[PDB]
Amino acid sequence: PFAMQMAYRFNGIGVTQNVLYENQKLIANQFNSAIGKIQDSLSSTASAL
Amino acid sequence: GVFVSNGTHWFVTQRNFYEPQIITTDNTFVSGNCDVVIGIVNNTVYDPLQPELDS
Amino acid sequence: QPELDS
Numbered sequence: 001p002f003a004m005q006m007a008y009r010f011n012g013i014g015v016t017q018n019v020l021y022e023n024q025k026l027i028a029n030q031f032n033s034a035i036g037k038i039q040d041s042l043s044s045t046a047s048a049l
Numbered sequence: 050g051v052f053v054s055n056g057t058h059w060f061v062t063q064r065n066f067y068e069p070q071i072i073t074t075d076n077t078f079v080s081g082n083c084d085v086v087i088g089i090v091n092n093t094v095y096d097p098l099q100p101e102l103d104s
Numbered sequence: 105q106p107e108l109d110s
């Protein structure tokens with residue numbers, strides 16, 4: 001499962017996995033906002049590529 | 050490792066080779082209470098010292 | 105074990 005995958009990747013950078021599990025909804029909301037910022041930066045620019 | 054169920058009983062095992070162990074307090078660590086983990090499961094955690102330190 | 109046998 002994807003949240004257990006993300007917990008083990010938190011464990012890989014030296015953060016304990018309870019930090020992920022206790023902040024799961026905040027971490028998923030920060031991720032969805034950053035994906036939206038990528039999308040509208042590519043809908044509003046000139047020369048990224 | 051990860052908590053796994055064989056169908057009735059819960060164990061802990063390493064991720065790359067199946068080798069199940071009894072869930073004790075040397076296997077695990079405590080953090081917080083049970084209402085802030087999506088998907089938490091009720092089970093028992095064995096003390097590996099106290100049934101034969103009761104002297 | 106072999107010292108805290110209280």
Ligand SMILES: *[C@@H]1O[C@H](CO)[C@@H](O[C@@H]2O[C@H](CO)[C@@H](O)[C@H](O)[C@H]2NC(C)=O)[C@H](O)[C@H]1NC(C)=O
Pocket residue numbers: 055056057058
């Ligand atoms: C899951 O593991 C448990 C514990 O190792 C198994 O329980 C044992 O089952 C056998 C026969 O079914 C009994 O002779 C033992 O006494 C049981 N041990 C305990 C501690 O209860 C259980 O059978 C396993 N389940 C599956 C589906 O493999």
Ligand SMILES: *[C@@H]1O[C@H](CO)[C@@H](O[C@@H]2O[C@H](CO)[C@@H](O)[C@H](O)[C@H]2NC(C)=O)[C@H](O)[C@H]1NC(C)=O
Pocket residue numbers: 091
């Ligand atoms: C796991 O065990 C706990 C008790 O240790 C159960 O929590 C109770 O659940 C009922 C049903 O909603 C509540 O009325 C009680 O107030 C709860 N107790 C406490 C102390 O909060 C819980 O239901 C069990 N989980 C499952 C899936 O059965």
Ligand SMILES: *[C@@H]1O[C@H](CO)[C@@H](O)[C@H](O)[C@H]1NC(C)=O
Pocket residue numbers: 087088
């Ligand atoms: C897994 O999905 C079931 C429904 O299929 C749901 O009831 C349960 O809350 C989910 N568990 C987790 C840990 O997300």
